Amino acid sequence: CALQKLILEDCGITATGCQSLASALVSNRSLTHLCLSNNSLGNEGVNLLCRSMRLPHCSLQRLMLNQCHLDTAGCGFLALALMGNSWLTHLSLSMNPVEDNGVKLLCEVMREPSCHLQDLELVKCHLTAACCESLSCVI
Amino acid sequence: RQLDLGSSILTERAMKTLCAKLRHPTCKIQTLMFRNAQITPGVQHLWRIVMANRNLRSLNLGGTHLKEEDVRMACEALKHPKCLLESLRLDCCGLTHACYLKISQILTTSPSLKSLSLAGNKVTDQGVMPLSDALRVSQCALQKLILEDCGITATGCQSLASALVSNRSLTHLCLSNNSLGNEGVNLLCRSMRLPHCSLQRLMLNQCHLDTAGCGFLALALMGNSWLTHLSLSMNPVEDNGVKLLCEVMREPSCHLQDLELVKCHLTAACCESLSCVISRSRHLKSLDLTDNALGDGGVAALCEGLKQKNSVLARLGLKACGLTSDCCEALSLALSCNRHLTSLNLVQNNFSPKGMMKLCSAFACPTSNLQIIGLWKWQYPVQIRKLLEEVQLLKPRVVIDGSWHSFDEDDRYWWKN
Amino acid sequence: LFWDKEPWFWHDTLTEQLWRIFAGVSRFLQSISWDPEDFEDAWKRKRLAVPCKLEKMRILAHGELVLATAISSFTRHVFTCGRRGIKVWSLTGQVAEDRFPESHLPIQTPGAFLRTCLLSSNSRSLLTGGYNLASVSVWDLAAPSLHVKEQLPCAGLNCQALDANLDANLAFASFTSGVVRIWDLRDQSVVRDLKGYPDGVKSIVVKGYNIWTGGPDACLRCWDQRTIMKPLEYQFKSQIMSLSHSPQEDWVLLGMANGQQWLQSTSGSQRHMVGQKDSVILSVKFSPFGQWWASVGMDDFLGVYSMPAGTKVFEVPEMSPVTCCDVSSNNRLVVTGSGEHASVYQITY
Amino acid sequence: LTFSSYGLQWCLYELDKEEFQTFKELLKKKSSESTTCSIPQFEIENANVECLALLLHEYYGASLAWATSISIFENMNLRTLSEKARDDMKRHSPED
């Protein structure tokens, strides 16, 4: 396989699709972009992607998850995976009911030197002043 | 060796006379206890013996009232080079800031004292900072510390974080019934992420934790191999927090052995995760799940976990989980299959007579070797009582006592208090 | 006693051996402990803890069916009630089983019985009444000799439940003719009278300015002394056997004679299940500190339950059906009565 | 004088050690807020149950001491002992 980009908008995939795609991702070493928009993957799908990305040979650079009904739990999973990995460079979690706590977790993982995240766009995450203070320290 | 006073109204002359006969070097008593007694007028007399006698090892006070002069006398008595006292316990003495300062100074100066407990004292962050400053120095010889109902806040948490990163001697720490919250959990976690930390047991009960605190602790748990015990009881840590901890603990590098959590609002999903952990992990040796509505699905999941021959789980704790007949049948089958489980516990449940028959039959199998079982005999009809007595006749080593915490090691409950 | 293969004391062995020699031919049961210091129960690792233990410590033989039981703790006695009279026991001595009461209280009148009894919360008075009787009598327990001090007149009426309230000096009664009366111990003159329900009210409980009653019709009603307004009716599915009101909070606990228990709150009409059993409940009693309640039924079992949610801690078996129970004020002792015997248990936590 | 104090001591001898300390603290707070009659703090701290009841009667007064103790009992969430105290006061306090 020689794929570099893949757009799957409004496909309505489930956790089983998460497992299939994540195993395929782990086996493969050519993919670099992946967009999974408007799908109710949920925190369990986030967990399967987290595990499949925990390996140090993973070399995908960009992934996005818009309108997946996320919460603080999936944010904790993403924070856990992100640590110790320096290849994934772009991410996004938009229009999700993440709270102050999820942003604090992401800041805590990202605040260390070893993190290589470069872009992060978030819209409508019910933020407040505390998130601003944490992001100020991170910046 | 051991002397105690279950209750008493001692006169000053009485305590003077008692202490007079204990300053003699021929005495050999190791421990003491005065927690329930009322000995306030003669407490000052207690210090001369600890200064003089050499074989005294422990000293327990409690509920008494201590004045500044008394604490100064305690400091001076501890400051004698000849003392070998290796434990102290002050409780509800209602100390003052200067008292904490003096205690910190003696801690940094006294080499013998290897423990200290302050439960019920009003020790605000202004009482936490001097102790942390004493801990920072490299001579401190403390190894345990208890702080109950002190009501510390985030500032105390960051003071302790700095002390811990600086310090390299302390091993046991208990901060229970304090309103730390997610911020304090995060501060301690940050201090603990370093590879040179040397803490082995920490417990945080009634700390107002939540999902976020569990996420922070799980995050700081990865990349550590010294901490061996943990306990987060009576906090509304939902299924998701336990799921995060299980995800962290599923790795082969973790060295966590004991984990207890009570009254956490658990369900079947956490049970699926924990069954996975038990089947896979190779260092977990204990577990507790009380007052949780685990139900038939949860017990079935844990049973599918313990059926495996690889598991090395030693003791399991079930109680007030709302069980029934089918789940007891499944548990009996699992206990028939397993060979490493030794301890167990089942109380505050509703077993039907058929279920109890199943459980006794399973306990009968030669393969299983359970050295403790938690059940009430008299709560059943005569048929069941004679059946359980018959089971007791085979394997005379088996013990069936409803009140658990029997044959449990002394350290587990002596450390906490 | 019966539960063990044989009950034995420490001096029993020596006495038996000496007797055998003279004629030429745990294991050791314990006695109750009264002082509070000697309990010496360590903190789990005046109180609101939920109990976690039981053990029988005596049996009381009455000789005939037992209808009502009461236990005083300020004084150690116990009171049993039967169709022909009342017997007063004691708990101070140490014996496996008792046969010699402390006093007998007989009634001589053709076709005269007793059916109910009730003790005052101060342990100073004892209401007694029954069928075809002249009046409801009150006994003066504080005096150096039992004797009736007052009489409450009633003609051609049978009393099936009693109650009292010592703060305002009010004594209550319920009769099989669906009539609930009142009195005053200062003058002994009927103050009011509530009627209109021929089915009647089997149980009545008094607290403050309300009077809750229930009967076979499967309804609970509330009356207020100050006014003469009509009662507030609640609808249930089965009959009601007994009631008890929490001393701490606002709840009313009852048994529905179909193995169900429900809680009712005065402020608003709220209910929820707190237990289920295959038998029929015949009594329910509330602890002095409102953290747990006991329930004695017909399927030879004594149960203890937890107030916050209704989960059951444990239960004990018996041989004969039970019909009464009573929890001491210390919160330690619980008495029960079945068949022709009245046994005593102890609670340790 | 002694007759009522006897019942009061018997009321305060059902109190546990921690309950006794809490009662002493509440009484100290009440006294400090009070300016009509002042009670030394060291005497309160050094006194036992019998001395506590006798002094509470001595400074405050029979009926007033009973009322204060009943109120504090209610504050500590001790209902039953309060009712016992009220009844024993009804039976011990002479008519006035």
Q: What is the per-residue DSSP string for C292-345? A: EEEEEESSSEEEEEETTT--EEEEEE-SS-EEEEEE-SSSSEEEEEETTEEEEE
DSSP 8-state code for residue B264: S
For residue C30, CA distances in Å to B72, C96, C192 come to: 48, 10, 51
- The whole-angstrom separation of Cα C115 and Cα C131 is 7
Place of tokens 């002042």: D38
- The whole-angstrom separation of Cα B55 and Cα C206 is 64
Residues 6+ apart with CB under 8 A from C302: C294, C295, C296, C315, C316, C318, C322, C325, C336
User: Quick check: B65 and D45 CB within 8 A?
Assistant: yes
Residue type, C182: I
**In this complex, which chains have at least 3 CB pairs below 8 Å with chain C?**
B, D
β A7-9/A33-37 pair status: parallel
Nearest CA in chain C to B322: C311
User: Quick check: D18 and B63 CB within 8 A?
Assistant: yes
- Which residues pair with residue B38 across a beta bridge? B9
CA-nearest of B324, B315, B317, B319 to B297 is B324
State how far Cα C246 lies from the chain centre: 15
- Contact at 8 Å (CB) between B193 and B223? yes
Residue to test with chain B: of C2, C278, C315, most B Cβ within 10 A: C315
Q: Which residues of C touch B413 (CB under 8 A)?
A: 45
Which of C46, C247, C248 is closest, CB to CB, to D19? C46
Alpha helices in B172-221 (DSSP H): 182-192, 211-221
| CB within 8 Å of chain B, chain C residues 25-54 | 37, 40, 45, 52, 54
CA-nearest of A123, A91, A130 to A110 is A91
The string over B135-162, giving b where at least 16 C-beta atoms fall within 10 Å of a residue's C-beta and e elsewhere, is: bbeeebebebbbbbebebbbebbbbbbb
Q: Which residues of B touch C3 (CB under 8 A)?
A: 378
User: Quick check: D17 and B65 CB within 8 A?
Assistant: no
User: Quick check: B212 and A104 CB within 8 A?
Assistant: yes
- Contact at 8 Å (CB) between B133 and B156? no
- The whole-angstrom separation of Cα C77 and Cα C93 is 11
CA-nearest of C251, C214, C253, C220 to C234 is C220
HSE (side-chain half, CA atoms, 13 Å) at B226: 16
For residue B304, CA distances in Å to B301, B321, B335, B391 come to: 5, 18, 11, 25
CA-nearest of B77, B133, B71 to B110 is B77
Six token digits for residue C337: 């009565």
Distance of residue B106 Cα from the nearest chain A Cα, in angstroms: 38
Interface of A with B (CB under 8 A): 43, 47, 50, 72-73, 76-77, 79-80, 83, 101, 104-105, 108-109
- B293: phi then psi, degrees, rounded to nearest 5: -80, 60
SS3 B65: coil
Q: Which residues of D touch C46 (CB under 8 A)?
A: 14, 16, 19, 78
- The whole-angstrom separation of Cα B370 and Cα B391 is 12
Six token digits for residue A71: 């919460």
- Contact at 8 Å (CB) between B23 and B49? yes
User: Quick check: D80 and C247 CB within 8 A?
Assistant: yes
Residue to test with chain D: of C122, C246, C287, C327, most D Cβ within 10 A: C122
| CB within 8 Å of chain C, chain B residues 376-395 | 376, 378-381
Gaps in chain C (C–N > 2.5 Å) come after which residues? 25, 45
CA-nearest of B356, B344, B286 to B319 is B344
SS3 B108: helix
β C135-140/C125-129 pair status: antiparallel
Q: Which residues of C touch B320 (CB under 8 A)?
A: 311
Nearest CA in chain C to B380: C317
SS3 B192: helix
**In this complex, which chains have at least 3 CB pairs below 8 Å with chain A?**
B
Phi-psi region of C285 (alpha: psi -120 to 50; beta: other; left: phi over 0): beta
CA-nearest of B385, B348, B388, B355 to C315 is B348
Longest C-alpha distance within chain C, in Å?
81
CA-nearest of C212, C283, C282, C223 to C252 is C212
Distance of residue B380 Cα from the nearest chain C Cα, in angstroms: 7
Which of D19, D79, D87 is closest, CB to CB, to C247? D79
Interface of D with C (CB under 8 A): 14, 16, 19, 78-80, 83, 87
State the DSSP H helix or E strand holding residue C71, giving kind and residue range, or none if neither: strand C68-71
- Contact at 8 Å (CB) between C50 and B291? no
- Contact at 8 Å (CB) between C294 and C274? no
Which of C45, C54, C313 is closest, CB to CB, to B348? C313
- Contact at 8 Å (CB) between C144 and C151? no
Q: How many CB pairs under 8 A join B and D?
A: 7
Distance of residue D75 Cα from the nearest chain C Cα, in angstroms: 13
Nearest CA in chain B to D16: B36
- The whole-angstrom separation of Cα B67 and Cα B71 is 7
CA C254, C256, C261, C263 torsion: positive or negative? negative
Q: Which residues of D touch B9 (CB under 8 A)?
A: 48
> Within an 8 Å CB–CB cutoff, is residue D96 touching chain B?
no
User: Quick check: B379 and C37 CB within 8 A?
Assistant: no
CA B12, B16, B17, B18 torsion: positive or negative? positive
Q: Which residues of C touch B417 (CB under 8 A)?
A: 45
CA-based radius of gyration for chain A: 14
Cβ of D44: how many Cβ atoms within 10 Å?
17
Nearest CA in chain D to B65: D45
Helix axes A72-82, A42-53, angle to 10 degrees: 0
- Which residues pair with residue C88 across a beta bridge? C79, C103
State how far Cα C54 lies from the chain centre: 18
Which of A80, A83, A108 is closest, CB to CB, to B247? A80
Helix axes D2-12, D80-92, angle to 10 degrees: 170
User: Quick check: D45 and B63 CB within 8 A?
Assistant: no
CA-nearest of B192, B191, B235, B237 to B215 is B237
Residue to test with chain C: of B7, B9, B260, most C Cβ within 10 A: B7
Q: Which residues of B touch A80 (CB under 8 A)?
A: 218-219, 222, 244, 247-248
Distance of residue A77 Cα from the nearest chain B Cα, in angstroms: 7
DSSP line for chain A:
------EEES----HHHHHHHHHHHHH-SS--EEEEES---HHHHHHHHHHHH-STT----EEE--SS---HHHHHHHHHHHTT--S--EEE--S----HHHHHHHHHHHTSTT----EEE--S----HHHHHHHHHH-
